[PDB]
Amino acid sequence: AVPKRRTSKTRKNKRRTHFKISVPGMTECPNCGEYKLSHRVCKNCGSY
């Protein structure tokens, strides 16, 4: 129900090994040389 010891910095940075985020799909647009998400519309002269 409550922690018996504190958590060391070593054990805290290992648990956070997998707490990260990945970049999006983000391909280049053919109409404008740009970047857009895959399968979404372009936010710059919206084409698809």
Partner 1 sequence: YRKLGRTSDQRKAMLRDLATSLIISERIETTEARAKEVRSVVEKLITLGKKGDLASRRNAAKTLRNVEILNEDETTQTALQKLFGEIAERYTERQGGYTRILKQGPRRGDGAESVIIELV
- In the stretch 21-40, what mask flags binding to RNA with x, by CB under 7 A? x---x-xx-x-------xxx
The full 3-state SS of the chain, as one line of letters, equals CCCCCCCCHHHHHHHHHHCCCCCCCCECCCCCCCCECCCCCCCCCCCC
Q: List the structure tokens of 24.
A: 């999006």
Provide, rounded to whole angstroms, the least separation between the CB of residue 30 and Zn ion.
8
Q: Which residues are at the interface with partner 1 (CB under 8 A)?
A: 37, 39-41, 43, 48
Q: Which of 43, 44, 45, 48 binds RNA (CB under 7 A)?
A: 48
Q: Which residues are at the interface with Zn ion (CB under 5 A)?
A: 29, 31-32, 34, 42, 44
